[PDB]
Design a protein around this ligand. Structure first.
Ligand SMILES: CC1(C)S[C@H]([C@H](NC(=O)COc2ccccc2)C(=O)O)N[C@H]1C(=O)O
Ligand SMILES: [Zn+2]
Ligand SMILES: [Zn+2]
Length: 240
């Protein structure tokens, strides 16, 4: 697997069917799935798997149901603990394309209320539960029951108006999804649904929400330093 967009395979990557898994911490793995483009090649998308004692938590689906069912099969084989819930980080196919596989498995799914409202318009199935957010971006705790180490933060509109992010408490990892691009990126990716006015502030708000996270995970590049945040914000400064 050699994607046109997204990180390549490296030492420490485990191939499992059509997907790639990489351990990031004792209890955190990155899942990677690929959508092949007629004429362009494969585009990688990354999410996370977190072990929290006797249960597993997932951030983001794969691009498709079948790929997402493979994530669940990898969890069964390598961890052998139940998936308690999944959080999906906005209403686009790379993050929510496999909702039906989670539902078929009986996994409780959560997304920003706005993501659930946009899902029908975006060709997605809504999560079964809605997260809501305070005026400073922090999730309302009663809407995120029993989330363990997942600390959900809405940084403001950027890549989309509904994009959310997730810090992993008890680790130095934070997940920026499609909002954050890596420190070497040349572009901000698909800006078709983006808020170019507010993007820079939203990227910086993510950094300030998780100020001690040193490993920044993102949808389409390998985990990076905090320069992913600062570089994304610098590129976004140019859009205003
Ligand atoms: C990696 C991206 C540039 S595309 C992805 C997202 N597209 C889809 O999920 C489904 O459409 C397609 C998906 C892939 C290729 C073509 C169509 C979007 O529109 O934002 N997020 C972008 C990003 O992270 O910048
Ligand atoms: Zn998107
Ligand atoms: Zn994306």
């Amino acid at each position: 697997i050699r994607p046109t967009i997204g990180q390549q395979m490296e030492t420490g990557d485990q191939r499992f069917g059509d997907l790639v898994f990489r351990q990031l911490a004792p209890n955190v793995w990155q899942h990677t799935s690929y959508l092949d483009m007629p004429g362009f090649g494969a585009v990688a998308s990354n999410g996370l798997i977190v072990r929290d004692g006797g249960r597993v938590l997932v951030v983001d689906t794969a691009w498709t149901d079948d790929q997402t069912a493979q994530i669940l099969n990898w969890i069964k084989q390598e961890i052998n603990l139940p998936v308690a819930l999944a959080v999906v980080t906005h209403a686009h196919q790379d993050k929510m394309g496999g909702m039906d596989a989670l539902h078929a498995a009986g996994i409780a799914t959560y997304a920003n209320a706005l993501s659930n409202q946009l899902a029908p318009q975006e060709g997605m199935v809504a999560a079964q539960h809605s997260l809501t957010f305070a005026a400073n971006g922090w999730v309302e705790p009663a809407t995120a029951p029993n989330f363990g180490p997942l600390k959900v933060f809405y940084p403001g509109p950027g890549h989309t108006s509904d994009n959310i992010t997730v810090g992993i408490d008890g680790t130095d990892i934070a997940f920026g999804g499609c909002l954050i691009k890596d420190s070497k990126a040349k572009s901000l990716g698909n800006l078709g649904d983006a808020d170019t006015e507010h993007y820079a502030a939203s990227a910086r708000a993510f950094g300030a929400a998780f100020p001690k996270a040193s490993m920044i995970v993102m949808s389409h590049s390998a985990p990076d330093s905090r320069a992913a945040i600062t570089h994304t914000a610098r590129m976004a400064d140019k859009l205003r």
